[PDB]
Amino acid sequence: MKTQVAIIGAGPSGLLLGQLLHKAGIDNVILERQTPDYVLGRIRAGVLEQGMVDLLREAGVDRRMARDGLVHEGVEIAFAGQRRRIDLKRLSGGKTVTVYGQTEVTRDLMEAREACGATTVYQAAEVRLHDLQGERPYVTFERDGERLRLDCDYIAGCDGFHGISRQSIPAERLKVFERVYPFGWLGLLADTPPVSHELIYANHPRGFALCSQRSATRSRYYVQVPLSEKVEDWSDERFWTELKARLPSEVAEKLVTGPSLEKSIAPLRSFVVEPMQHGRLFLAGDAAHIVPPTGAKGLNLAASDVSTLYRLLLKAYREGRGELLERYSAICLRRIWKAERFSWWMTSVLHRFPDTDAFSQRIQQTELEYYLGSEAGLATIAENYVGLPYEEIE
Ligand SMILES: Cc1cc2nc3c(=O)[nH]c(=O)nc-3n(C[C@H](O)[C@H](O)[C@H](O)COP(=O)(O)OP(=O)(O)OC[C@H]3O[C@@H](n4cnc5c(N)ncnc54)[C@H](O)[C@@H]3O)c2cc1N(C)C
């Protein structure tokens, strides 16, 4: 096979980049290890930044989101028997976020790509990268038995945290920055109306809790749990009972519960590699960095990496300015770190950490009181939540 840009991974990152590149006349082939249905089984993200929303419209894949998505102008934080609303629209200068499931986004992109006739190879096993330092790199893989080769000009590693792309770069050329948190998020998707029209992040003595949604009739709740917990030990009943216990009584009382459509435990981690490229290989999304879900930045950083890489690839193909691709990592890393810092802060002030001394506890409580009780404080939260502006490039 032969293409211009080879893309590893049919997740949100690969699909969005592929779609974007396709519409601009740049040939691209996506290689996915799993099956279409397997990819669609992942719930994940719910909050999208305006930047991601715009990138979707630019990909021509926004019909459904426009119709089914919900724009939120604020979020609530509950702590120490208080409930503080963060007016995102007002504090950020008019910016908002949109609630639209990652599953739907992925689905919208997949159907759109199939309709356009772009190349996507699912169940592509043993993906291996080759000749990344040359001008003619290629990818090898196995499909239903035989080994195939895909020649290209550039490879976009969009294969997630455990993708092969980041492992295809000489370790000594990369610097890893990482932190694993002493707890995970037990999530529960239920076909019930959300308890609130806006998200509710709750710091409670018993632990973190979050009330989110996917639509007017679909909810997504999370509760903090230690690493030792196994999802099989948490029945829907146990979840609802614990969730209720971590929420203000006036909220737990009217909460509509129901059987889970999906339950699982996701560990929290911050991760960043520098640089994010190597020769003809560029890493995007989870392949290059991870953030705890607390700040709703994971998918949105994948979006900004993709926007940056796409625009640089345009410059390269349309304008023969391939040397600009050298600025990919630098550009992306600046937005990444600021998003990592916010995600870390959110995680830091909303979760209960084991072995917390009296001082740390008081500081965490005061962080909320100050940031939630100051116009300037609220502003640092809002502007970061809606997401910082994309860097123009060039
Ligand atoms: C609880 C949760 C909430 C989240 N909430 C939000 C949120 O509201 N807002 C937000 O911005 N982000 C959130 N996240 C994070 C977000 O979901 C992630 O950052 C996002 O999924 C990243 O997207 P991508 O970079 O595209 O990465 P993905 O992991 O989604 O997709 C990568 C694809 O690569 C494939 N693959 C892997 N190895 C391969 C190989 N060697 N060869 C070929 N294919 C391979 C995989 O099968 C897969 O299909 C969340 C993630 C969570 N979980 C479970 C991880």
Please state the domain extents for the chain: 1-72+96-180+269-351, 73-95+181-268+352-388
Q: Nearest CA to 158 among 41, 300, 7, 37?
A: 7
Query: Cα 98 vs. chain centroid, distance in angstroms?
Result: 13
What single-letter DSSP state applies at residue 352?
P
Tell me which CATH homologous superfamily contains domain 1-72+96-180+269-351.
Answer: FAD/NAD(P)-binding domain (3.50.50.60)
What was the experiment behind these coordinates? X-ray
Residues 6+ apart with CB under 8 A from 59: 16, 19, 20, 23, 109, 112
Q: Please give the positions annotated as active site.
A: 72, 201, 293, 297, 385
Q: Respond yes or no on whether the N-terminal peptide bond of residue 293 is cis (omega within 30° of 0).
A: no
Atom of ligand 1 minimally distant from the CA of 15: 26
Where would I find the beta strands (DSSP E) of the chain? 5-8, 28-31, 47-49, 70-72, 74-79, 82-87, 97-99, 119-121, 125-130, 138-143, 146-151, 154-157, 175-190, 200-202, 209-215, 218-225, 260-274, 277-278, 281-283, 289-290
Ligand 1 site, residue 32, Cβ cutoff 6 A: yes
Asked if 8 and 166 count as a contact pair (C-beta separation under 8 A), the reply is no
Q: Which helix (H) or strand (E) holds 104?
A: helix 102-116
Residue owning tokens 């998003």:
339
What single-letter DSSP state applies at residue 2?
B
Residue owning tokens 């600009």:
324
Side-chain half-sphere of 358: how many Cα atoms within 13 Å?
0
**Ligand 1 probe mutation, 102, 162, 263, 388, most atoms within 8 A of CB:** 102
Asked if 166 and 287 count as a contact pair (C-beta separation under 8 A), the reply is yes
Tell me the CA–centroid distance for residue 327 and ligand 1, in Å: 24
Tell me the CA–centroid distance for residue 125 and ligand 1, in Å: 19
265 to each of 187, 260, 377, how far by Cα in Å? 6, 14, 32
Q: Cα(86)–Cα(84) distance, rounded to whole angstroms?
A: 6
Ligand 1 site, residue 40, Cβ cutoff 6 A: no
Atom of ligand 1 minimally distant from the CA of 212: 8
Asked if 368 and 319 count as a contact pair (C-beta separation under 8 A), the reply is no
Q: Cα(316)–Cα(5) distance, rounded to whole angstroms?
A: 12
158, β-bridge pairs: none
Q: Cα(189)–Cα(245) distance, rounded to whole angstroms?
A: 18
Q: Which amino acid is at 315?
A: K
117 to each of 110, 112, 179, 317, 318, how far by Cα in Å? 11, 9, 41, 21, 22
Atom of ligand 1 minimally distant from the CA of 301: 11
167 among annotated binding-site residues? no
DSSP three-state, residue 192: coil
Ligand 1 site, residue 387, Cβ cutoff 6 A: no
Ligand 1 site, residue 286, Cβ cutoff 6 A: yes
286 among annotated binding-site residues? yes
Tell me the CA–centroid distance for residue 160 and ligand 1, in Å: 6
Atom of ligand 1 minimally distant from the CA of 127: 42
Q: Euclidean distance between the first and final Cα of the chain, in Å?
A: 33
Same fold, 1-72+96-180+269-351 and 73-95+181-268+352-388: no
Ligand 1 site, residue 127, Cβ cutoff 6 A: yes
Q: Nearest CA to 48 among 137, 7, 109, 5?
A: 109
Ligand 1 site, residue 201, Cβ cutoff 6 A: no
Q: In the CATH hierarchy, which top-level class contains the domain 73-95+181-268+352-388?
A: alpha beta
